[PDB]
Amino acid sequence: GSVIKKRRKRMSKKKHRKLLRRTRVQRRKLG
Amino acid sequence: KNVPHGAAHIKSTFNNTIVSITDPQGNVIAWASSGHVGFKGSRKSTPFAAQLAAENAARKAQEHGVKKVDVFVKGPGSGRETAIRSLQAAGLEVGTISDVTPQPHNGCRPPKRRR
Amino acid sequence: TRKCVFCSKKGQTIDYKDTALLRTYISERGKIRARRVTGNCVQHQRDIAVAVKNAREVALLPFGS
Amino acid sequence: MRPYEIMVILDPTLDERTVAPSLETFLNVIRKDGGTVDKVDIWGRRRLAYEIAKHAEGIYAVIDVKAEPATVSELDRQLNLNESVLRTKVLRTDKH
Amino acid sequence: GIRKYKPTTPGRRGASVSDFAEITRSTPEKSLVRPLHGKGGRNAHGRITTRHKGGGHKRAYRVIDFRRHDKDGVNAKVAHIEYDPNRTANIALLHYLDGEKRYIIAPQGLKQGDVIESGANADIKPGNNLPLRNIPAGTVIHAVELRPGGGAKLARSAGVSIQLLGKEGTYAALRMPSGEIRRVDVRCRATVGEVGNAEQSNINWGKAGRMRWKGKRPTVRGVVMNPVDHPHGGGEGKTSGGRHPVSPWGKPEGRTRKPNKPSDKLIVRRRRTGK
Amino acid sequence: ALTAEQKKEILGQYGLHDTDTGSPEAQVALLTKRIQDLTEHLKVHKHDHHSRRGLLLLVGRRRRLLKYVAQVDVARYRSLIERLGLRR
Amino acid sequence: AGREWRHESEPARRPGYFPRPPEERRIIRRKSFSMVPCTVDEAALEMEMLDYDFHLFTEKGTGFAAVLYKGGPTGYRLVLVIPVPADELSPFEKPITISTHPAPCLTQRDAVERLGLLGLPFLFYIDAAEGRASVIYRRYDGHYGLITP
RNA sequence: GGGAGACUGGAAUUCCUGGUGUAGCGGUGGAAUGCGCAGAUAUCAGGAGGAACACCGGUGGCGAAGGCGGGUCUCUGGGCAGUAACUGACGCUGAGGAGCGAAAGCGUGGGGAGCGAACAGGAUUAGAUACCCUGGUAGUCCACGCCGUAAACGGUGGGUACUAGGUGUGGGUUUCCUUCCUUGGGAUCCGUGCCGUAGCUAACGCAUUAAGUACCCCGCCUGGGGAGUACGGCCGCAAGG
């Protein structure tokens, strides 16, 4: 199939990973 | 000194050629490089620069008493052909031609591919 | 093509001691000759390669003279 | 009790007339271990393909033994420990 | 091996103790034990010369045979492996065939009932002692002498080994555990194999009590001292000393080996740091 | 695997008669001997996972054979289990 | 160098002969046209109608084997087994020059190796085993053409 | 070249030492950082150390999958063929569950030649947190353990029976040309490719190694985003799953 779907999925996963990197310490302090 | 018989080591890389005449016990007696004959940068990767370096090394060995020599080529082909032709053309007799290139038996990791 | 001189009824055994039978199978540079240029079967080619390597290990054949 | 073939290369300086007796003593252990049979052949003073331990010539000896694997390993250890043995190589004359 | 204490108490949380698996006897030989009393780090004048010493559990000295030069040609049988408090390594009790008992530091892999021989005709099994001239190059040795007769001095700690590189002339080039390369006369005897108890360094001592039992007084930092006591002392609040680091007697950091020692000619290359 | 003599002695001791080799008793005995040998081997080489898979296959086959025996005749199953020490 | 191809990518350098790599290269052309003594002009005429760039003959005055070839813009060039001056060489009218180097002594495999590592259209040499002249050239099928007496 | 352990071989790279030896070497599309003139590069001799095993070597072998080739020894798993002596349906699948599971990554202890995230400069560019160049730490390696993910793909779950052929190639049995040397050819069993009927498909294509004709069992899908995300829970040192 076309790689457009894979592009959407990788963008979503990348954004989630960046969010996790940004809030790692806050999650640890609240967890 | 006077060394009637010696060896010639030619290392022709992709961007330079180095020619060295050697007393057969392994002692360099006269060497000429591609950049030593007035070339610099990519200009010294040309076969003409190899010709000039080989001729200069041949003269710098000839006045030292070298008459007959045997050549050990080495390196990817840039100016080896012209190097040996110039070694002959400068009055230096060529005894034998030997291709001794360091060939690993798949050892060490080569650098990553360019793009 | 060519003949696997070992699959024949007169096929001499392959050993790392008999150096001439191996020298006839390596090129002048000492490299092991290909199977097609020789024509022997796969098992005999593998046995020849193993014998050549062993003979090199025991200093009976040069390592690329 | 399996059959083995041990090829040894010794330095050329030592006299050949002592190679056969000395090697004999080296097999004595494997002779007294489990009732083993030996066949010794010597074709030495042949120049090596490449330099081994600052040497160009070497004495080649072939020993056909029929013994236990532990005994052969112990014999190989002793042979490698000896300073007059340049190299040893052990093969199995069985299907392997 | 290493046995880790369960975190039942705050003093035992991260603690661990050596699992004395190789020890085969809980008592030493009565004829090989000499009295030993603690000095406290104080020399013949009664003044403290080495700080952070004193206290600690009382211990006795087991006479170790670092000079195995008499029993050449006499085989010995390892009778036991015991615990020596004066050293990190474990000691093995030998029973020579003539009827004499001796103590040696147990090499790596030595087991009860093994046969230990010595001399020029000895084998190259671990535990055997023979002069460096008869030891083939490349092997691993320990308890090496420095002069032909002075006894073992080098590679005596636990898990420590010396790699014999090669012999030339009358000198053998050894790679010390520090990585330093030194030459030594070939007449010096050596023992084959690594030293046992290699896992001892992985011990976590848990609390200050263990160190106090081992005989180590607390060590006070220099920046919490006063300027009369230490060069780093003084200042309001915490400080770094306000001066390049120095010993309590003012000697600055750097090389302290005295130059032009007579042994400088026998050192091939010194150890290296930060490589 | 086992040598010919070990197989012969196991078959003679556990076989129903002097000829059978595929009887479930003989198969279970041979599998148990192989399993104990493989366990003794694996106690030295802990990281030999492929032989561990082979051991798992042998264990499963022995369990299936014991299931068949217990389904056909209970007394034979009890006798075999008690004779081979086979826990189950 | 070889990976990937584009419109302006450098065209592959192809020799005149069919490749026929060292594997089964062989020597399947052995001419022995003429060894009757000739002079320089006669050798040049024997060159011209044969349409061959080089030609191996035996010289009149010397009695030695020699090879003539086109010396390029300099004219023609003559190579002898042992270099001799023009005076000993038989009289001629064509403008030629003599190669000062002598034909060396070397084996068959060494000759093939020298030809490969020296890239000349041919190699003229005194064979080690034979002791006589020989000219090897890469043929038009990839094999080496060894011309012998 | 199925797996584990032990010992060991050579070429080559790097570094060190000692000769000969000079003014450049290196690098690129072109250069500059960089190295060298305190003696570099080159050449010879010696030494140390680590990693990977040129030729054999392929759409060829083994393995359930990941994956697996320098040599020798020890231990060990699986497969195929023939005889059909033996047991006599003991078979298939398998919710959960357990085990194995590329690389990257984590912990403890070692090792560290080459390569090399990060990080420095050099260069290109309007801008270069990049592509190219010079250096280079983790890491890549070993031992014991963790994690449990991949375009982990043949994007094709496992077992069985049947349905035109033709031709390569691996392994094993046998009849006839018969020299019996020979891929002689035939027959047959087990793999591994290519082309092609019927048939199937939306088409591309698959086509005896089915994506054809049918039977047994399991897993999975119900428009695209939100989202394999939030909450809750389990596992994990952590990343995270």
Curated annotation (Swiss-Prot), chain B:
Ribonucleoprotein is among the record's keywords: yes
Query: Which biological process terms from the Gene Ontology are attached to this UniProt entry?
Result: translation
Which superkingdom is the protein from?
Bacteria
GO MF term list? rRNA binding; structural constituent of ribosome
Which parts of this chain are annotated as the region Disordered? 97-115
Q: Which GO terms describe its cellular component?
A: ribonucleoprotein complex; ribosome
Q: What keywords appear on the UniProt entry?
A: Ribonucleoprotein, Ribosomal protein, RNA-binding, rRNA-binding
Tell me if Magnesium is a UniProt keyword of this record. Answer: no
Entry function: Located on the platform of the 30S subunit, it bridges several disparate RNA helices of the 16S rRNA. Forms part of the Shine-Dalgarno cleft in the 70S ribosome.
The Swiss-Prot or TrEMBL record describes its family as follows: Belongs to the universal ribosomal protein uS11 family.
- Quaternary state and partners of this protein? Part of the 30S ribosomal subunit. Interacts with proteins S7 and S18. Binds to IF-3.
Instruction: Identify this protein by name.
Output: Small ribosomal subunit protein uS11
Species of the source:
Mycolicibacterium smegmatis (strain ATCC 700084 / mc(2)155) (Mycobacterium smegmatis)
From Swiss-Prot, chain C:
A cellular component term, taken from the record's GO annotations: cytosolic small ribosomal subunit
> GO molecular function terms here?
small ribosomal subunit rRNA binding; structural constituent of ribosome
Q: For this UniProt record, give its keywords in alphabetical order, as a comma-separated list.
A: Ribonucleoprotein, Ribosomal protein, RNA-binding, rRNA-binding
Membrane spanning residue stretches: none
Question: Per the record's keyword annotation, is rRNA-binding included, yes or no?
Answer: yes
Could you tell me the Gene Ontology terms of the biological process aspect for this record? translation
Q: What does this protein do?
A: Binds as a heterodimer with protein bS6 to the central domain of the 16S rRNA, where it helps stabilize the platform of the 30S subunit.
Give the record's subunit note: Part of the 30S ribosomal subunit. Forms a tight heterodimer with protein bS6.
Belongs to which family? Belongs to the bacterial ribosomal protein bS18 family.
Protein name in UniProt? Small ribosomal subunit protein bS18B
Q: Which organism is it from?
A: Mycolicibacterium smegmatis (strain ATCC 700084 / mc(2)155)
Report the gene name: rpsR2
Span within the full-length protein is: 17 to 81 of 84
From Swiss-Prot, chain E:
GO biological process terms, alphabetically, are: cytoplasmic translation
Show the ranges annotated as biased composition (Basic and acidic residues).
Answer: 252-267
Q: What Pfam families is this protein classified in?
A: Ribosomal_L2, Ribosomal_L2_C
| Membrane-spanning ranges | none
GO cellular component, as recorded: large ribosomal subunit
Annotated region Disordered: the residues are 1-19, 24-57, 222-275
User: What is an example of a GO molecular function annotated in this UniProt entry?
Assistant: rRNA binding
Q: Where is the composition biased (Basic residues)?
A: 36-57, 268-275
Q: Which InterPro entries match?
A: NA-bd_OB-fold, Rib_uL2_dom2, Ribosomal_uL2, Ribosomal_uL2_bac/org-type, Ribosomal_uL2_C, Ribosomal_uL2_CS, Ribosomal_uL2_dom3, Ribosomal_uL2_RNA-bd_dom
Q: Which Gene3D superfamilies match?
A: 2.30.30.30, Nucleic acid-binding proteins (2.40.50.140), Ribosomal protein L2, domain 3 (4.10.950.10)
Q: Which UniProt keywords apply?
A: Ribonucleoprotein, Ribosomal protein, RNA-binding, rRNA-binding
Domain of life of the source: Bacteria
| Protein family per UniProt | Belongs to the universal ribosomal protein uL2 family.
Question: What role is this protein assigned?
Answer: One of the primary rRNA binding proteins. Required for association of the 30S and 50S subunits to form the 70S ribosome, for tRNA binding and peptide bond formation. It has been suggested to have peptidyltransferase activity; this is somewhat controversial. Makes several contacts with the 16S rRNA in the 70S ribosome.
Subunit comment = Part of the 50S ribosomal subunit. Forms a bridge to the 30S subunit in the 70S ribosome.
Query: Which protein, by its recorded name, is this?
Result: Large ribosomal subunit protein uL2
- According to its UniProt entry, this protein's organism is Mycolicibacterium smegmatis (strain ATCC 700084 / mc(2)155) (Mycobacterium smegmatis)
Gene symbol here is rplB
Curated annotation (Swiss-Prot), chain F:
Keywords, A to Z?
Ribonucleoprotein, Ribosomal protein, RNA-binding, rRNA-binding
Name the SMART domains on file: Ribosomal_S15
Pfam families (alphabetical): Ribosomal_S15 (PF00312)
Record Gene3D superfamilies: 6.10.250.3130, S15/NS1, RNA-binding
User: Which NCBIfam families has this protein been placed in?
Assistant: S15_bact
Question: What the protein does?
Answer: One of the primary rRNA binding proteins, it binds directly to 16S rRNA where it helps nucleate assembly of the platform of the 30S subunit by binding and bridging several RNA helices of the 16S rRNA. Forms an intersubunit bridge (bridge B4) with the 23S rRNA of the 50S subunit in the ribosome.
User: Per the similarity annotation, which family is this?
Assistant: Belongs to the universal ribosomal protein uS15 family.
Tell me what this protein is called. Answer: Small ribosomal subunit protein uS15
